[PDB]
Amino acid sequence: RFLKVKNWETDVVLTDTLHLKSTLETGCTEHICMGSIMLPVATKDQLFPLAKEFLDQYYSSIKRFGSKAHMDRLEEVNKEIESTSTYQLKDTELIYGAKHAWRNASRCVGRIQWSKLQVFDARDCTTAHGMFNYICNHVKYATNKGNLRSAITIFPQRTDGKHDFRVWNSQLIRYAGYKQPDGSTLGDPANVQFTEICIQQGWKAPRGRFDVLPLLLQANGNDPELFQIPPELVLEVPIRHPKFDWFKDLGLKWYGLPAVSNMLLEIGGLEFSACPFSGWYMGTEIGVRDYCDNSRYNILEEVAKKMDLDMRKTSSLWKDQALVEINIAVLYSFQSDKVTIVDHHSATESFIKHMENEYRCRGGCPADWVWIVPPMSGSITPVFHQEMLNYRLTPSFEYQPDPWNTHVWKG
Amino acid sequence: RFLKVKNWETDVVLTDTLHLKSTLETGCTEHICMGSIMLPTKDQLFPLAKEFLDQYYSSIKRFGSKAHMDRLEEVNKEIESTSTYQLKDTELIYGAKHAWRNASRCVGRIQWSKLQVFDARDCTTAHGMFNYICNHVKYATNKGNLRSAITIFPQRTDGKHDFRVWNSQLIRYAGYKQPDGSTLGDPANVQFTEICIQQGWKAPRGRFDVLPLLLQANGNDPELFQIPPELVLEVPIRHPKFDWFKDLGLKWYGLPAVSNMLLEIGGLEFSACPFSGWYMGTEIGVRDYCDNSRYNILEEVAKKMDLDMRKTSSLWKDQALVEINIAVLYSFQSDKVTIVDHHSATESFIKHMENEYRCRGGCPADWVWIVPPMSGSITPVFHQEMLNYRLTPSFEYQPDPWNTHVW
Numbered sequence: 001r002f003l004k005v006k007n008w009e010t011d012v013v014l015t016d017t018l019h020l021k022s023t024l025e026t027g028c029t030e031h032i033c034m035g036s037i038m039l040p041v042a043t044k045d046q047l048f049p050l051a052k053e054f055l056d057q058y059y060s061s062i063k064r065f066g067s068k069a070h071m072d073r074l075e076e077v078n079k080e081i082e083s084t085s086t087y088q089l090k091d092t093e094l095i096y097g098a099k100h101a102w103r104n105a106s107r108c109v110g111r112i113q114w115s116k117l118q119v120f121d122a123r124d125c126t127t128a129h130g131m132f133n134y135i136c137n138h139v140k141y142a143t144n145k146g147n148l149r150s151a152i153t154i155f156p157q158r159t160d161g162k163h164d165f166r167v168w169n170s171q172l173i174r175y176a177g178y179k180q181p182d183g184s185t186l187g188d189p190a191n192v193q194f195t196e197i198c199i200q201q202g203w204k205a206p207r208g209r210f211d212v213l214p215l216l217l218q219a220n221g222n223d224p225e226l227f228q229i230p231p232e233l234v235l236e237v238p239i240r241h242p243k244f245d246w247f248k249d250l251g252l253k254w255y256g257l258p259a260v261s262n263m264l265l266e267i268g269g270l271e272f273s274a275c276p277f278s279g280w281y282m283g284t285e286i287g288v289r290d291y292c293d294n295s296r297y298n299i300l301e302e303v304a305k306k307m308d309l310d311m312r313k314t315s316s317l318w319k320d321q322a323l324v325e326i327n328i329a330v331l332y333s334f335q336s337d338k339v340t341i342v343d344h345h346s347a348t349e350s351f352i353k354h355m356e357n358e359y360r361c362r363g364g365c366p367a368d369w370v371w372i373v374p375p376m377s378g379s380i381t382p383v384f385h386q387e388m389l390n391y392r393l394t395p396s397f398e399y400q401p402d403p404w405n406t407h408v409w410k411g
Numbered sequence: 412r413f414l415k416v417k418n419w420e421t422d423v424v425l426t427d428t429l430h431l432k433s434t435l436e437t438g439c440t441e442h443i444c445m446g447s448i449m450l451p452t453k454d455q456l457f458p459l460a461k462e463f464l465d466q467y468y469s470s471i472k473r474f475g476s477k478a479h480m481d482r483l484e485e486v487n488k489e490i491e492s493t494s495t496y497q498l499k500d501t502e503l504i505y506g507a508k509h510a511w512r513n514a515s516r517c518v519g520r521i522q523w524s525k526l527q528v529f530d531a532r533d534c535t536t537a538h539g540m541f542n543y544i545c546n547h548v549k550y551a552t553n554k555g556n557l558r559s560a561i562t563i564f565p566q567r568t569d570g571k572h573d574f575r576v577w578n579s580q581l582i583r584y585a586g587y588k589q590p591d592g593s594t595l596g597d598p599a600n601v602q603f604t605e606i607c608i609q610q611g612w613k614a615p616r617g618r619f620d621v622l623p624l625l626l627q628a629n630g631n632d633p634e635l636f637q638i639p640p641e642l643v644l645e646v647p648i649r650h651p652k653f654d655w656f657k658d659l660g661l662k663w664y665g666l667p668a669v670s671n672m673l674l675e676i677g678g679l680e681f682s683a684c685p686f687s688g689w690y691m692g693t694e695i696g697v698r699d700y701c702d703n704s705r706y707n708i709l710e711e712v713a714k715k716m717d718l719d720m721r722k723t724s725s726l727w728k729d730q731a732l733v734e735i736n737i738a739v740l741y742s743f744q745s746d747k748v749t750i751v752d753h754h755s756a757t758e759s760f761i762k763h764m765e766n767e768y769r770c771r772g773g774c775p776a777d778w779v780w781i782v783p784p785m786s787g788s789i790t791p792v793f794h795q796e797m798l799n800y801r802l803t804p805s806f807e808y809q810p811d812p813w814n815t816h817v818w
């Protein structure tokens with residue numbers, strides 16, 4: 001069965017056949033749409049079929065489907081599963097898998113880049129110290145003095161679920177948040193709880209508005225340990241505005257490397273619970289969400305005051321006005337310091353081209369409109385006008401529960 | 412069964428039970444989400460009638476009463492004999508208010524129970540339709556103090572005797588294809604505008620020409636009528652800081668009045684049911700003015716503002732977008748024509764969702780449509796999980812009559 005999607009601005013119609021290759025469930029039914037809900041040990045039994053579909057995909061992609069090498073690999077994996085309860089991916093299969101997980105990431109607008117992903121194989125890692133070292137190398141390689149390069153580091157797979165590798169940070173680089181007794185928060189309110197654990201684990205907190213948090217790393221199911229990323233490795237950008245000289249006096253800065261470290265990577269039924277990956281920022285992620293969310297740094301009012309806007313009524317659009325200025329500032333500051341950034345107009349334009357390409361060559365592109373449409377100026381970006389189809393393909397990146405909720409403390 | 416929705420800004424969690432009373436299909440399945448698709452007999456009629464009467468009688472706390480059972484028998488018999496039935500006035504008003512209440516794509520529902528219902532079921536000709544419509548326009552406009560209203564024409568019979576308003580809204584501006592290749596006025600209405608000329612409308616060929624009404628009674632060929640100019644409230648668009656804004660030659664009409672939808676109550680189909688409320692500012696300022704395939708005035712405005720148009724990364728479009736929307740709200744407020752900004756409309760909707768969860772056990776809502784087309788995340792609806800499902804009575808789309816009508 002074929003499905004059509006229309007762009008209402010250009011009239012371009014595309015046909016999706018790829019959704020037929022879809023295994024996993026969405027949360028939706030014929031009676032209810034869950035499209036705006038944020039979140040809607042494996043046995044031999046379930047493992048060989050997952051391995052098989054994955055290796056069929058891999059061998060089709062290299063144009064070797066049905067070959068002796070294809071058949072011998074299936075046989076070898078099947079034998080390894082019966083013998084050991086699991087299996088090991090070849091390096092070529094791991095690279096393909098990590099790339100396809102990004103390719104399949106329906107909420108990611110940056111996917112035009114999917115095939116340029118530097119994969120670091122850290123499956124030989126055994127301790128938290130080894131983790132720390134793999135993570136510094138990643139950050140250095142990805143940062144590249146401001147000329148950012150996409151990368152992922154893959155730590156050993158889950159075995160019995162009792163020996164998990166986890167990065168306890170949600171991103172490799174993030175700022176501390178501190179709850180004061182008066183109920184105000186110092187720093188980033190998103191990281192309050194994580195900051196508290198770090199401190200509990202013996203981190204000596206500088207207690208400022210932008211303290212780069214330490215790494216909290218768990219190897220082999222062991223209790224996690226604290227490490228400070230060398231500051232010379234953390235590229236940061238002071239935020240100023242090209243026309244408002246007072247903007248710099250707000251004291252704002254942000255880090256250049258967005259690196260998600262709390263997702264689970266699934267490839268052919270194997271689960272990689274520590275797989276930090278990084279790209280580069282779209283400006284609105286910092287300027288709209290990190291700075292302007294009421295539950296984040298929440299700087300709209302302060303900026304609006306300094307602009308001397310009329311704040312007595314919402315209908316003056318003072319929030320909207322300050323919002324654009326803050327976002328101008330983020331982009332200007334990054335470009336001036338030669339740190340890779342993309343604005344929402346250019347990123348979305350690129351995504352539409354990627355999506356059309358994908359329909360033509362792959363037969364589809366799963367996309368989550370709720371997430372792809374930028375959080376400001378939605379309808380002046382071409383994605384607002386593009387119909388999309390959301391479905392789950394593997395390999396995939398999945399959410400997982402925060403580790404402090406599940407971890408068995410050894411002591 | 413029980414479903415929870417979370418607001419990620421406030422941590423408020425609501426439990427939805429109302430979805431279990433849903434009957435129509437969403438377009439989604441377990442395998443695919445279609446949430447961003449724009450368009451995703453006697454035996455047929457009695458269950459539909461019964462389901463509606465049951466909710467009606469329950470709404471007036473008379474479920475299972477003599478009045479209830481008796482009404483069900485009366486409808487059963489009329490269906491058995493005529494193949495259709497007729498709504499009581501009380502049921503028609505209840506059904507209309509509830510079609511609005513159930514409109515998942517509507518952010519302005521807090522107001523649902525204050526809808527004036529005009530029963531035009533005794534209408535028989537296009538001239539009668541015109542009279543009813545002019546009366547609706549004048550009542551709703553209320554010299555700028557807008558009041559919500561719906562006018563309901565005779566229900567479908569065999570489907571060859573349909574009442575239809577061919578306009579998409581009662582008041583819209585013309586669009587003409589030009590020798591240059593560009594478009595004068597509103598490009599969304601190019602097709603409708605040519606049909607009007609094809610029927611003999613003498614077009615002034617300007618940028619803001621109020622379209623005639625084209626009205627179809629009882630399956631007949633449709634007929635042109637000019638709405639009395641003094642019934643069409645319009646707002647000249649000026650800016651509170653920018654003197655030059657007035658000279659862009661922009662204006663808009665005060666009354667948004669959707670006229671191409673179908674109202675379904677208890678299996679009965681009302682194919683002409685124009686309804687109206689008042690604008691949220693972004694509908695005009697973001698969509699009507701700044702969509703690339705609409706008036707598309709972004710390039711022009713940013714030009715007057717002397718912005719850096721060289722790179723998208725100067726956010727010149729975003730800067731201009733904001734100023735335009737300040738202008739729309741300022742103009743309407745200065746002229747005392749009702750309008751709501753996206754911040755206040757979305758705040759009310761969150762209040763309404765809360766009312767509905769505690770009083771009705773839920774509120775169907777389509778996030779893709781509720782979140783305003785600018786400044787999404789600075790409005791509270793952005794951070795609100797919503798469940799979308801289809802309750803009846805409802806408003807539904809229907810094909811454009813020109814692709815269907817038999818001449």
Ligand code: HEM
Nearest residue numbers: 102105107108109110113150151277278279280281282397
């Ligand atoms: C190269 C530049 C990239 C850009 C500009 C970009 C952009 C974005 C944006 C804006 C989001 C939405 C997240 C939010 O706003 O909360 C997102 C989500 C996501 N992206 Fe990317 N991305 C990039 C690279 C990558 C890479 C390298 C990967 C992994 C290989 C990745 C995988 C994902 C995943 C799994 C999500 C979903 C996050 C979640 O569900 O919370 N992206 N992307």
Ligand code: HEM
Nearest residue numbers: 511514516517518519522559560686687688689690691806
């Ligand atoms: C009173 C003030 C009202 C406000 C501020 C308002 C707001 C809106 C908005 C912003 C939309 C989104 C459509 C778009 O962006 O193109 C919408 C859709 C809709 N509204 Fe309302 N509304 C109001 C009154 C009404 C009334 C009186 C009715 C019917 C009695 C109604 C029924 C609907 C329906 C059925 C839709 C979806 C139509 C479609 O799919 O195009 N609304 N509303």
Ligand SMILES: Cc1cc(N)nc(C[C@H]2CNC[C@@H]2OCCNCCc2cccc(F)c2)c1
Nearest residue numbers: 038039258259260277278279280281282285399
């Ligand atoms: C690799 C990369 C590059 C880039 N520019 N941007 C990204 C997304 C992250 C950065 N800026 C925001 C995103 O952060 C990660 C997503 N946050 C969790 C989503 C979620 C799901 C379910 C429940 C929740 F409470 C939250 C990744």
Ligand SMILES: Cc1cc(N)nc(C[C@H]2CNC[C@@H]2OCCNCCc2cccc(F)c2)c1
Nearest residue numbers: 449450667668669686687688689690691694808
């Ligand atoms: C009554 C009322 C008041 C108000 N403020 N706002 C409204 C929404 C209308 C006006 N501003 C635009 C909306 O017009 C109706 C929406 N048009 C149909 C959408 C659609 C769906 C599927 C396929 C398509 F091609 C098009 C109604």
Ligand SMILES: C[C@H](O)[C@H](O)[C@H]1CNc2nc(N)[nH]c(=O)c2N1
Nearest residue numbers: 036037038370371793794795796
């Ligand atoms: C409730 C709602 O689904 C939630 O706020 C989503 C909406 N869209 C988003 N889109 C992106 N890119 N990132 C987000 O965090 C969210 N949040």
Ligand SMILES: C[C@H](O)[C@H](O)[C@H]1CNc2nc(N)[nH]c(=O)c2N1
Nearest residue numbers: 384385386387447448449779780
């Ligand atoms: C493709 C997508 O479904 C389409 O552009 C929708 C998105 N959200 C919308 N939201 C509103 N309120 N009105 C619209 O016309 C649209 N268009």
Ligand SMILES: [Zn+2]
Nearest residue numbers: 028033439444
């Ligand atoms: Zn869905």
